[PDB]
Coordinates of C-alpha atoms in Angstrom, one line a residue:
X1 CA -57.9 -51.2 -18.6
X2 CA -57.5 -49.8 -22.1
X3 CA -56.5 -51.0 -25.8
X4 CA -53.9 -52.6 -27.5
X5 CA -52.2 -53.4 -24.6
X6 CA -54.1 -51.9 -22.1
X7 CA -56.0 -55.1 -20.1
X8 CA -57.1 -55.5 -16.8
X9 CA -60.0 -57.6 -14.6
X10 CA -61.4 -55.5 -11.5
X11 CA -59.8 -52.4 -10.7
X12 CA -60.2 -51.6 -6.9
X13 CA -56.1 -51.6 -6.3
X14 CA -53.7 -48.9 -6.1
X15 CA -51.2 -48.1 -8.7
X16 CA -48.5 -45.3 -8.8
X17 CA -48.0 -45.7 -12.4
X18 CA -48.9 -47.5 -15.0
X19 CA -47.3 -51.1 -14.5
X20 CA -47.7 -50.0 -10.8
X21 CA -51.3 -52.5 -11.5
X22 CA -50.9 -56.1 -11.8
X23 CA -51.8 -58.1 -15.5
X24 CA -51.4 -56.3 -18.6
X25 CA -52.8 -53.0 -16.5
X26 CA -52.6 -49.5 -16.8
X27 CA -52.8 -46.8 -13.9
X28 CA -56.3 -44.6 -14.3
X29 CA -56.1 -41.1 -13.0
X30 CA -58.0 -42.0 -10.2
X31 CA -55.1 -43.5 -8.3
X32 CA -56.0 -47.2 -9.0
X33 CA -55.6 -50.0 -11.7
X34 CA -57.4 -49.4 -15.3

């Protein structure tokens, strides 16, 4: 999750990139939604 844009409930799912995250999610560097 982050601004303007950047939205997301619970992150505890994979992403790969960015839009990889469902919702208006990001990808954190972590290897999972933000």
């Amino acid at each position: 999750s982050g601004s303007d844009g950047g939205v997301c409930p619970k992150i505890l799912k994979k992403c790969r990139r960015d839009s990889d995250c469902p919702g208006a999610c990001i990808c954190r560097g972590n290897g999972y939604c933000g």
